[PDB]
C-alpha cells in the first residue's frame, strides 16, 4: 500500500527493535504497510523467524541483543549489506520489571543504554546522507529518554535527521477492578490500542515530518 | 487507502485564503475531507471556492460576530452535514479577541461533535515572527482545558505550534535561521501535515497535546 | 454499556414499528448499547409509550411510513434534535386473503410493508453516504419476501461509501399473540424465539464491528432454512 | 463488563490459533471472558499461544488427524477447565481437513448435548478449489445443525472473503483482489473474530445452520 505519495515510506529502511508483539509489532506492520523495508528484532532466532513470517516480502526478523555491541554491529552490517543503510530507527525494546546491582544494570542497559548505542551506530550513515529518523518509544528507567531525545535532536538537526519521543499512556497489551482503576486516570475513558502508537511513530517517520524534531508526542487519551 | 483517510469528514478551516490556512484546507481536501474554508470577505470566499472545486467551498465568516458564526454553521450543516473537524487558524486587544473567536467557534461545533461522540479541534498558534508568546500560551491554555472536559465523549482538542514558516509575512533572515537548529524555514505544507495527522481517525488517542513544528527551535 | 465492544454511543438509531414485540426489543437494546434511539408508531399515544420506556436514551415519534411528508418531517425533527440518522432499522409492517381484499387495501399493505422500506432507506442514505458511514437493517421473515432482493441490490450500490445493508430474517418468534404444537414441530431447536434474540442480531449488525458484513441475510430461526 | 456478549464461564477450544484469524479469534473470546485453549501442531507453537493468552487460557499441541491426540487434548481441557462449551474449527487436502472437523465436532458434542448447551463454529478459508472446500464445510454445518438443534447446540459457518493475512500479503494482484469487493477494502482478521464471537455468545442461541459471510459484499 501507500497508493499515493502522502506518508509514503517506499525506499526507506526501518529498524524496529522489540517487534515481536504488541507495540513493536504494530509499529513494524504499519511501516511495512506504508512501504518501508522493515527489519524487526527479537532476542531469539525463533522470535526473529516469527517476525519474518508476518513481514513476508516487506522485510525480515533478526536476532539482536541491544546490550551487546558485537550484536548491534553484526545486525547493522547484515541490514546494510542486504537492504541498504538504516533510514528510520525505532527504539522500542525494553523489559518491564529489592534487586541486585547486576539485575539493575541489566535493566538500564536494555531500556536506556541501548538507545544511546543503537542511535549512535545508525547516525553515522544518516548524517552522511543528511536524512534520517530516530523515534524513541518511551512512556521503568525510560523517563531519561525525553532528555536524551532533546539533546541528540539539537546536535543533529542541521544534518537533516530528526529525533523524537512518542510517549504512550496505558495501552492494551497482551498482559477486573484494577482495570477500572486504570481507566479512571484516562480522561478519554479507554485504553489505547498498539495501532495508535504505530500511527504516531509512522507519521514522525515520514518525509512530511521533516520539520518536527526534539518533540515528545504523547499518545495517552489526555492523561497529560 | 484507509490510512489517514478523511472521506466523509466535514472540515471547517478558518483563515483559509492563503499560506498555512490554505495549505491546511488543500491537504484535508486531498485526504478526502469535505472542506469549508473561511475568509472575511465574499470575494475571499469565492477564491477559496475556486481552489477547492468539488471538494468543498468558501464562506464569509466574521469570527467575532455570533450571528455570522451561527449562520455559517447552519449553512454547512444544511449542505454538508455536521462539522467533524475544526481548524482555528489565523498586542493584548488583538490576542484577547482572536482568542475569543476560538472559544465561540469551538463551543458552537462541539454541540454536535459531542452528541456524535466524534470530533477534532485543532488550534494553530501563530508563526514565530512577548506578544507572540502571550498569544501562543493563551491558545495552549484553552486547548488543555477544553480537551480535559470533552475527552470522554470522543472529541480531541490539540494545538499545532509553528516555528518560523515561509509565508507572506516573513536580511534578518540570516538571524531568523540562526535560531533554528534545522537551519531552514518551514513550509506551510509541513504545518498542514501535522494538522491533518491530528485530524485523522488514527489520532483518536492524542488530546491535550501541543505538537511543535519548528525544526527543533523550542 | 461500559466497553468499546459493540458500543453504539454517539449513534442515532431510527427503529420503525417500535411499540411492541421485536421493534420494542430492538429499540431497547440499541439504547442499552448507548444509541440515541428514535422509535416510531402510527399514533401519538403509541409514540408517547415509546418515549416512556426510552426515557433519556431517546424518544417516540408518530410516523406514517406510507406518506413522504411524514417521513420528511420525522427525519428533519431527528436531524434537528439528535443529528443525522446513523442506523435505520426497518421493522414496520401489518401482518394480516389477497383475493378478497380491495385494490386500495392491498396497495396499503404493499406501501406499509415494502414501499416504505425503499422510501425510508433512500431518505436516510443521503446523509449516511455523505458521512461514509451507515447501517440499514431490514427485519423481514417470509415484511414481504421481496425484502432480501432489495437488501442485496442496495448493499452492492452503497458498499463503497461505508454503508452496510442487511436483512435479519426471524423465524417463529413469541409475540403477544394444538397450533403451537404444530408451530414448534417445524423448528429443529424445538422452541420459539424471543424478541430479544432478534434484537441481538440487529444490534450486532448495527455495530462498528460488523463493518465488513453487507448484503447478508442473517436467519434467526432455530434451524429452519 | 456487561452481560451483553459475555463469555465468562465458557470454555473455548480454538484450533489453528497461532496466527492471523485463529489468533484473532482466540484473543477476542478471551477479551470477552472465555477460558481459551488454542491449538497448534507443535509444542513450541502451543507455548507461543500460552504466552499471549496468559491467565485467560493456554496453548496445547493437537494433531487434528489422530483420535488419541484429540482424546488426550479433551481430557486435559476437561480436567483443568471443565467441558468444552465453544469449539471453533479454524483450518484431496479438502477431504482430510473436512474429516478433522467431523472428529473434533463429534468428540466435543458428547458433553455439549448432555449439557444441552454448546456452540460449534466452522471458519471456512479466506478467498475453484476454494469454493469446493467452503461447500464441504457448509454442507457439514447444515447437516450437523439439524441433528443437534433440539439439544441446545448451534452449529454455524463463518465464511471470510478476502482478509488481510500473511497469505494475501503483487501490487496489481491486490488491485485485482480489491476490484471484486464492493466495499473496496480487505477485511481485518478482527472482523472475522467478531462474527465468531457473536455466534459463540448466549445471545446467538436461536441462530443455527447459518452461513454468516464476512466479505464486504463480495459473494
Question: What attributes does this structure have?
Answer:
homotetramer; 224 residues; 7-stranded parallel sheet; 7 helices; NAD binding (chain D); Sc_DH/Rdtase_CS (chain D)
Question: Would you give an account of this structure?
Answer:
4 copies of one chain form a homotetramer. Chain A is an alpha/beta fold. Chain A has one domain (1-224): Rossmann fold (3-Layer(aba) Sandwich). Chain A is built from 7 helices and 7 strands. Chain A has helices spanning 22-33, 45-55, 69-83, 101-129, 145-156, 177-184, 194-205, and strands at 13-16, 37-42, 59-63, 88-91, 132-137, 161-168, 216-219. In chain A, strands 3-2-1-4-5-6-7 form a 7-stranded parallel sheet, sandwiched between helices. In chain A, strand 5 (132-137), helix 5 (145-156) and strand 6 form a beta-alpha-beta unit. In chain A, helix 1 crosses helix 7 (194-205). The longest helix of chain A is centred in the middle third of the chain and has 29 residues, at 101-129. The first copy, chain A, is globular. The relative contact order of chain A is 0.15. It is classed as oxidoreductase. The entry lists the keywords structural genomics, center for structural genomics of infectious diseases, csgid, Vibrio cholerae, FabG, beta-ketoacyl-acyl carrier protein reductase, oxidoreductase. It forms a tetrameric assembly. The entry is titled "Crystal structure of beta-ketoacyl-acyl carrier protein reductase (FabG)(G141A) from Vibrio cholerae". Chains A, B, C, D: 3-oxoacyl-[acyl-carrier-protein] reductase FabG. Organism of A, B, C, D: Vibrio cholerae O1 biovar El Tor str. N16961.
Amino acid at each position: 500500500n501507500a497508493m499515493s505519495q502522502f506518508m509514503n515510506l517506499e525506499g526507506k529502511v526501518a529498524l524496529v527493535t522489540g517487534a515481536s508483539r504488541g507495540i513493536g509489532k504494530a509499529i513494524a506492520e504499519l511501516l511495512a504497510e506504508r512501504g518501508a523495508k522493515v527489519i524487526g528484532t527479537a532476542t531469539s532466532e525463533s522470535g526473529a523467524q516469527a517476525i519474518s513470517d508476518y513481514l513476508g516480502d516487506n522485510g525480515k526478523g533478526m536476532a539482536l541483543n541491544v546490550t551487546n555491541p558485537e550484536s548491534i554491529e553484526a545486525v547493522l552490517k547484515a541490514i546494510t549489506d542486504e537492504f541498504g543503510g538504516v533510514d528510520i530507527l525505532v527504539n522500542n525494546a525494553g523489559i518491564t520489571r529489592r534487586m541486585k546491582e547486576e539485575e539493575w544494570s541489566d535493566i538500564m542497559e536494555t531500556n536506556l543504554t541501548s538507545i544511546f548505542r543503537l542511535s549512535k551506530a545508525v547516525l553515522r550513515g544518516m548524517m552522511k546522507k543528511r536524512q534520517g529518523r530516530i523515534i524513541n518509544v518511551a512512556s521503568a528507567a525510560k523517563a531519561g529518554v525525553i532528555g536524551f531525545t532533546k539533546s541528540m535532536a539539537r546536535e543533529v538537526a542541521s544534518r537533516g535527521v530528526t529525533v523524537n519521543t512518542v510517549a504512550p499512556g496505558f495501552i492494551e497489551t497482551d498482559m477486573d477492578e484494577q482495570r477500572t482503576a486504570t481507566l479512571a486516570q484516562v480522561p478519554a475513558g479507554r485504553l489505547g490500542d498498539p495501532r495508535e502508537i504505530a500511527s504516531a511513530v509512522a507519521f514522525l517517520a515520514s518525509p512530511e515530518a521533516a520539520y518536527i524534531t526534539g518533540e515528545t508526542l504523547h499518545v495517552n487519551g489526555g492523561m497529560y
